[PDB]
Amino acid sequence: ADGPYSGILDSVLDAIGNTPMVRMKRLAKVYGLECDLLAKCEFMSAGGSVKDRIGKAMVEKAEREGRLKAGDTLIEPTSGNTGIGLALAAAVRGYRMIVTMPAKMSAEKSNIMKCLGAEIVRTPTEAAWNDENSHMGVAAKLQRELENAHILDQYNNTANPMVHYDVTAEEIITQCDGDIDMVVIGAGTGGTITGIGRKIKERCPKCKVVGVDPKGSILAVPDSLNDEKRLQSYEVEGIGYDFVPGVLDRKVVDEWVKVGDAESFTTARAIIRNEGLFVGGSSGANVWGALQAARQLKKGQKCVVLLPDSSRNYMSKFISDEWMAEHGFAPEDGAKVKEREKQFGGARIRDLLSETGTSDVPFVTARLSVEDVIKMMHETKVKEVIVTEDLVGVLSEDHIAHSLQSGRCAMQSPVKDIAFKKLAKALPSAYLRDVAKALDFSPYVCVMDPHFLGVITRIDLLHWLATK
Amino acid sequence: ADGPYSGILDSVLDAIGNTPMVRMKRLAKVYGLECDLLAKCEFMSAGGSVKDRIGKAMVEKAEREGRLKAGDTLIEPTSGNTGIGLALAAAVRGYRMIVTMPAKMSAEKSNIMKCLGAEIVRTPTEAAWNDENSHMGVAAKLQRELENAHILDQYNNTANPMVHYDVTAEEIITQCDGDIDMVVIGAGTGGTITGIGRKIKERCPKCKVVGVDPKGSILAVPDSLNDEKRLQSYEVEGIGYDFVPGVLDRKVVDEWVKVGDAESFTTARAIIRNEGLFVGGSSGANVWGALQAARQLKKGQKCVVLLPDSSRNYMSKFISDEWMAEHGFAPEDGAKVKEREKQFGGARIRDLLSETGTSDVPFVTARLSVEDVIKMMHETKVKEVIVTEDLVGVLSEDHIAHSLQSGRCAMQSPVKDIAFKKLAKALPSAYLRDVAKALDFSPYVCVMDPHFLGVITRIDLLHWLATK
Ligand SMILES: C=C(NCc1c(COP(=O)(O)O)cnc(C)c1O)C(=O)O
Ligand SMILES: C=C(NCc1c(COP(=O)(O)O)cnc(C)c1O)C(=O)O
């Protein structure tokens, strides 16, 4: 029915949490997993991450103890999502925001915190926690150098795990009806795993809690698991640190699973492809850990995995196939790039132009009157023409006639005004996979040497694939 | 409480809709608006847009009439969000997706539909609806050329407005308790405004419904309002077309408001800044139309505005200040760029280096053993040093000591391994606003002519601002 959103909300802070739980049946059937893999889709909060909760939570504590007055400044070291949550809380309740984040993190987090009126100081990636050039040391320096400033310190504030123990874990319990067999959850500050695992083990002691730690971090138990890539920097954002945060109670977690970059990203793309959950990379790490840890489970049992982050924060980073190819990561089992590699292979546009059958595409200087160009088009019997300057684009008779009827194309007007201006350049040595990726962004694809041989669209490639 | 998400969900299709309504008090107080401006945050659906609903909806109709079997292909012309919704439905229920979208639309929509296993054919921006190079004409051609393909045709399918009449309008009614005085809603295909306005006027006849149409479109009534920029292409995505779609009942809408690009984008950024709703540009258009139309309303009355789209689809486009400066759009009344322009003005780093007070920053060839570099650092009494090749980065004694303790820095190892590798180049003629924007992405900022004068961080700029 409708209980929680059935009224009007006072601010965006009231739209945090209350996240649905979805059964990933298709993904389980893909990976050959017998049990029910439930996903807590924390990326669907108003701010698009689980950390929103603690952001809100901490401010509430700072307000329930009277420690915070209007106009104050908030400083917080973060990998990006807590900065967003605290920035939301500050823009709503009238506080000043300063974020300290490492250079490793994405630019979308930075831009979104900038739209929320927050100052952004970035710190070097390779700095240790002890360095005063660390995000935490720089935040401490800013607290020392700024008046009416406060560091809420999500690494040591009890609100961070207390709210995952109060509401989120209670959410997971009430939607799974108490029956939980495994919980796989990423270990960043460790607040989410601590709080959720504690509440669940209190209400369901037979539940195993699995912590996910990236290869490079030192949070897993024992240290014989962390020595794969000791303190080697990784790309996944959100989990793992070079120290044990104050809120992390590693004794409440039973197992530890090590997950690397390649597995995390390919499984995140698998989640998007097979379930349709616009999810982040750390959630790929958590789901890979869950698929490895819950392999021994049976049907009927429920393994709950946290999906912390939304794709919005890594929209240019790993959603783009260009960047995952530049970082040498296997795209996915079933993906568009591998599909194009399978169908096209090494076929180049030379092969298509040869199999179809003289580069006699008419050309005009792009400032002809439309009357002269239609006379040339009717005398040459071709339908399309290419306009270029001393390249401009393509121009069809259909658009000519319809825009003359529409009141957009004058008789004495230059053909530059009505030609199609979005184009993509190619050359015969190019493969067909690359022209398909180019067709993802541009309607036409034209060749050159300046002697162009023709125009290439998606239906031409479909016809070529039909000949195979 | 918890009614709708209190269980486990079968797929992401069940997480569509059920969107909360938030009162934009801060934004109303900013613009000087007396009434309650309620926002239906359709961008919080699982797919991040209102169109998810109709996407789901249409498939359901196509399944309830038995017209759709497993393995079929779905073709759909879209500005991007319906393509996403239908791609979600296809990935869940096992259908093949082909999207036809104009080149005007963002690349995030394309990439996200590619991650959902959908083929993407793009069409020219300037093409009219009649052209067979139009998104609709190309979709028709693909339907003619492909077997087991179906076009659900959101422009003419009754599911599109029927579901906004069945659930979404009923949602708005049940959360506003029947009392609605104005509804401002964007006119794209017109399905959302038709359905919602019809249901609301049926349940509350005293309600005015305001349609928003971008300057360039021909959907507003009368035509004396559309002649600002007749058929001139615009940047906002989602609303307005060169024809009246089949589902648009322009007689059920009372007013029409014309909103241009500049107003839409600056108001979208204002929404993000003042309310903290990660919202899209079309929602800026709708909110600007609402602020203009509901100006005559009183406190107590409720003006409901639709927020169709999520910022995720325009993350690189208009969230980035670079692109809004390149398109000559006023950033916002209160924004970080204008704040930096106010505090810094025309001050260049020459002025800061002069006011602070000899460019004697030590340099090393970036392959010295750490022992030699620490001896040089102790003999020069400086703390930081700059490593460069035949630029590499910066290197501090704090990181030296802590990483030697950490097991990451050998005695005979080269200083390249432990130096900070993320850097930003500047030159003395650069303004301070530009170095602040650069500091949004990089921890340090160093100058050059190759003679570097020093390193610049955020605390240095804070100190300079403290001297003013
Ligand atoms: C460390 C931070 N985030 C934690 C996090 C996590 C781990 O959540 P924890 O509450 O820190 O255990 C997983 N995924 C993402 C994307 C995350 O951002 C932060 O916001 O400073
Ligand atoms: C036209 C399409 N979207 C409609 C839309 C609208 C208008 O919604 P309509 O249901 O078409 O009236 C507003 N904002 C955005 C971002 C939109 O995408 C489409 O998905 O093809």
Automatic annotation (TrEMBL), chains A, B:
Residues holding pyridoxal 5'-phosphate: 81, 188-190, 192, 282
One GO molecular-function entry: cystathionine beta-synthase activity
Domain CBS: 358-411
Requisite cofactors: pyridoxal 5'-phosphate
Coiled coil: none
NCBIfam families: cysta_beta
Pfam families: CBS, PALP
Organism: Toxoplasma gondii (strain ATCC 50611 / Me49)
EC number: 4.2.1.22
Protein name: Cystathionine beta-synthase
SUPFAM superfamilies: CBS-domain pair (SSF54631), Tryptophan synthase beta subunit-like PLP-dependent enzymes (SSF53686)
UniProt pathway: Amino-acid biosynthesis; L-cysteine biosynthesis; L-cysteine from L-homocysteine and L-serine: step 1/2
GO biological process: cysteine biosynthetic process from serine; cysteine biosynthetic process via cystathionine
GO CC annotations on file: cytoplasm
PANTHER family referenced in this protein's UniProt entry, alphabetically: CYSTATHIONINE BETA-SYNTHASE
Catalytic activity: L-homocysteine + L-serine = L,L-cystathionine + H2O
